[PDB]
Each structure stands twice: as structure tokens, then as C-alpha cells.
């Protein structure tokens, strides 16, 4: 996930990401978008809900 997205998420309320077959590594990049109220992770191939 781009770091700039993580930075701007400080005011984001809804985020949707589509990887269409690409495995997505969060590597703990979600604890700065604290304003988010809706999280959509479609075709991101996690195989595990991130912490």
C-alpha cells in the first residue's frame, strides 16, 4: 500500500482497493487512517484479516 494513502487517510472515511489477483501486504499500514469508517478490500487476496 502506498505510504501517501496511509498519510492522507487521516481524514478519509471510505476506502476501496481492488488488486484483481494481486496479493496485498498491509504490513501494518492502517493504524494512521483512524478517521476511516468503511474499509473495502475486494480481490486483494489476504487469506487473513489484518490486525
Amino acid at each position: 500500500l502506498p505510504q501517501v494513502v496511509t498519510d492522507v487517510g487521516v481524514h478519509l472515511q471510505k476506502l476501496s482497493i481492488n488488486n484483481e489477483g494481486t496479493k496485498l501486504i498491509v504490513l501494518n499500514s492502517l493504524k494512521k487512517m483512524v478517521n476511516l469508517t468503511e474499509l473495502e478490500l475486494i480481490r486483494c487476496d489476504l487469506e487473513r484479516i489484518p490486525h
Partner: nanobody
Framework: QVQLVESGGGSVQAGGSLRLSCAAS????????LGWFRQAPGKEREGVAA????????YYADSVKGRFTVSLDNAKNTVYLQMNSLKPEDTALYYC??????????????????WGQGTQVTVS
């Protein structure tokens, strides 16, 4: 709205070959997801294949994987299906399937919004 026309099936032998096809008319740009759906006689329809419109990622059902090959002709707005060494399990009713944007249904007829006439494929 969007209409689909397909052909290229019929009666073949196990060990024959077929070249399925389907052409699209109407709104050709708005269609995001394309695939094939086959229907056994009296049984539920099965999503045969799936393809991203411009992302270009191809998908197929396990029962037809390695035997059925999707083909798309952007020039003529056509979707083909080329298969060989068929099996009697391929005898089914195949419908041209198109889905607009927002949906990520590879082989599920749940959200596809346009279907073709239906071509009977017979493999003995």
C-alpha cells in the same frame, strides 16, 4: 440495452474439437467482466470462464481448465471459446455472459446482467 449473439457449438464426439464464439451488440464499452456459462440438462448453470476487460486477467472453471480457452476479438467486439479433446461432461447449454463495472463475479451468474440466446453443445 446490450444484446449478445453466439454460435459455434452443436454435436461433437469425445475427442473432437469445437470453436465457440459470441459477438456483442449495443453498449460494447460499458461491459467490464466477460465469461462463459454452461448449463447441464436440468442442472444449475456453471460459470465456465472469466476475463477482465482491460486489466486483461483471464479466469476459468476447474472442470474446463486446460481444455477450454477463452478468446476475445476487440476489433469486432467478439468473444470466442476454443476447446479440443472434449468430454461428454461438456454437453451443456452455453450462454454468452457479460457484466458491467463494479462486479467481481468470475463464474457466478448472480450479478451478470446480460445473457445470450444459448447454444447447445453436444459431446457424446
Amino acid at each position: 440495452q446490450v444484446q449478445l449473439v453466439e454460435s459455434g457449438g452443436g454435436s461433437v464426439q469425445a475427442g473432437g474439437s469445437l470453436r465457440l464464439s459470441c459477438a456483442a451488440s449495443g453498449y460494447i464499452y460499458q461491459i467490464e467482466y466477460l465469461g462463459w456459462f454452461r448449463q447441464a440438462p436440468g442442472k444449475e448453470r456453471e460459470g465456465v470462464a472469466a476475463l477482465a476487460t482491460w486489466n486483461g486477467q483471464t479466469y476459468y472453471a476447474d472442470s474446463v481448465k486446460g481444455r477450454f480457452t477463452v478468446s476475445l476479438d476487440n476489433a469486432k467486439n467478439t468473444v470466442y471459446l476454443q476447446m479440443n479433446s472434449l468430454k461428454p461432461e461438456d454437453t451443456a447449454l452455453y450462454y454468452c455472459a457479460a457484466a458491467y463495472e463494479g462486479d467481481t463475479s468470475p463464474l457466478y451468474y448472480e450479478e451478470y446482467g446480460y445473457w445470450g440466446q444459448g447454444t447447445q453443445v453436444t459431446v457424446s
